[PDB]
Amino acid sequence: MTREEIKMIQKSWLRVIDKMDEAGLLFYRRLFDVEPKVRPLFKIDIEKQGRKLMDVLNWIVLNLQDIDAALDAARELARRHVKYGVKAEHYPVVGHTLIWTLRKMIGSEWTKQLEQLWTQAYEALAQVMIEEHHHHHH
Amino acid sequence: MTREEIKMIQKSWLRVIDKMDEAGLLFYRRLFDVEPKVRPLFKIDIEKQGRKLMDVLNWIVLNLQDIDAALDAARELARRHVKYGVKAEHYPVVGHTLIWTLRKMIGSEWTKQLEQLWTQAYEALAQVMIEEHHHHHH
Ligand code: HEM
Ligand code: HEM
């Protein structure tokens, strides 16, 4: 997840916080209208102090903030790559070669699911590093 | 990222480690055949001690292990949800309602990019929690 991405997530979260109570009511009312069967899981007076919307939003945001902080190490790695002469345009071919090599080495135990997981993991990490390359790239 | 997912990633990583040197050579040879222009970024004798494949694989795996450990808190949250009477089948509607509410509250500042980021973040967290529900679900 890139810095640009977490920034726009945080900004939209702040927008909801600004209208927190209104947003929370809207969430409950929509939830119970689309799926009345979950209504009994909540207090009869749940609108008065329940915070379902924020419970979910805050968990997401707090988790993403932890992941973003951890990715500072990847940004440090990218800065080293700048110094190695590596450019943002080089990341796709390394990724393709990574998957090509894994497919070869794992053989008949390689699966579409594995290919997807490794592809998504590489692509996400590469996107963080590419974002850093762009900042130093003169 | 679910426990099932990180397990299959780790298993495939162990398979590569078993043939680490062979895999590393294959990676370099493929890389330089598809993109000879990156060859000068590497030592003339890079096959002898370079570890590009493992450098990338290990970074991915070590990052994913940290995220998996952090997700123990989400599994704890899911266990509480089991006790609240929540079922795996309830997660989609909460997610749809989350996005519906954000779209409403954010209005003309809501974007397809924001919708995608929030959708993916919710879906991923929900998948971790659903996996836990399945274990307790009698
Ligand atoms: C997600 C992608 C990548 C990851 C996780 C990664 C990881 C690493 C790591 C851990 C090192 C060891 C040195 C250090 O920590 O600074 C390294 C070195 C290096 N990487 Fe990467 N790298 C990635 C992408 C690339 C790309 C796209 C290239 C382009 C050719 C590249 C070329 C190099 C070079 C030239 C070195 C130093 C020379 C060497 O180790 O032989 N890397 N990389
Ligand atoms: C990713 C999805 C979800 C997240 C992050 C989440 C988060 C939370 C949190 C932080 C709490 C406060 C209590 C605690 O920590 O145990 C809570 C309570 C609760 N949640 Fe969730 N939840 C999610 C999905 C759901 C779903 C799908 C339902 C189904 C209706 C649900 C119903 C409830 C109920 C009934 C409570 C306790 C009663 C209340 O707080 O009013 N949650 N949830």
Residue numbers in the entry:
A (entry chain A), B (entry chain A): 1 to 138
Reproduce, without paraphrasing, sentences from the article in which this PDB structure was first reported.
HGbRL from M. infernorum is a putative globin-coupled sensor of 274 residues, consisting of an N-terminal globin domain and a C-terminal Roadblock/LC7 domain. N-HGbRL consists of seven α-helices, helices A–H, lacks helix D and forms a dimer. It displays a typical bacterial globin fold except for a very untypical feature — its helices E and F unexpectedly fuse into an elongated helix. In other words, both the proximal and distal sites of a single globin fold are constituted mainly by two separate subunits, representing the first ever site-swapping example in the globin family.
Further optimization subsequently yielded crystals of the closed form, also in the same space group C2 but with only a subunit in the asymmetric unit. Intriguingly, the first turn of helix E in the distal site has unravelled, allowing Lys52(E10) to close in to bind to the haem at the sixth coordination site and to a water molecule, W2. Tyr28(B10), meanwhile, has been driven away to hydrogen-bond to both the N of Arg51(E9) and Lys52(E10), as well as to W1. The closed form of N-HGbRL is hence the first globin structure with Lys–His hexacoordination. In the closed form, meanwhile, Lys48(E6)–Arg51(E9) are untangled and no longer form the first turn of helix E, which tilts towards the haem and binds to it. Loop CE is also pulled towards helices B and C, stabilized by new hydrogen bonds between Arg39(C5) from helix C and Phe42–Ile44, between Gly50(E8) from the unravelled turn of helix E and Ile46, and between Arg29(B11) from helix B and Glu47. The side chain of Trp59(E17) has two alternate conformations in the closed form — one with an occupancy of 0.6 facing the solvent and another of 0.4 flipping 180° inwards — but in the open form it flips inwards, appearing to act as a switch between the two forms. Once the ligand dissociates, loop CE may tend to assume the closed conformation as it is stabilized by the interactions, absent in the open form, with Arg29(B11), Arg39(C5) and Gly50(E8) that pulls Lys52(E10) towards the haem. Clashes between the antiparallel pair of helices EF in the dimer are avoided, in particular, by the Ile67(E25)–Ile67(E25) pair in the closed form and the Ala70(E28)–Ala70(E28) pair in the open form. A signature of this subgroup may be haem hexacoordination or shielding with a residue at site E10 or E11, instead of E7, such as Lys52(E10) in N-HGbRL and Leu57(E11) in HMP.
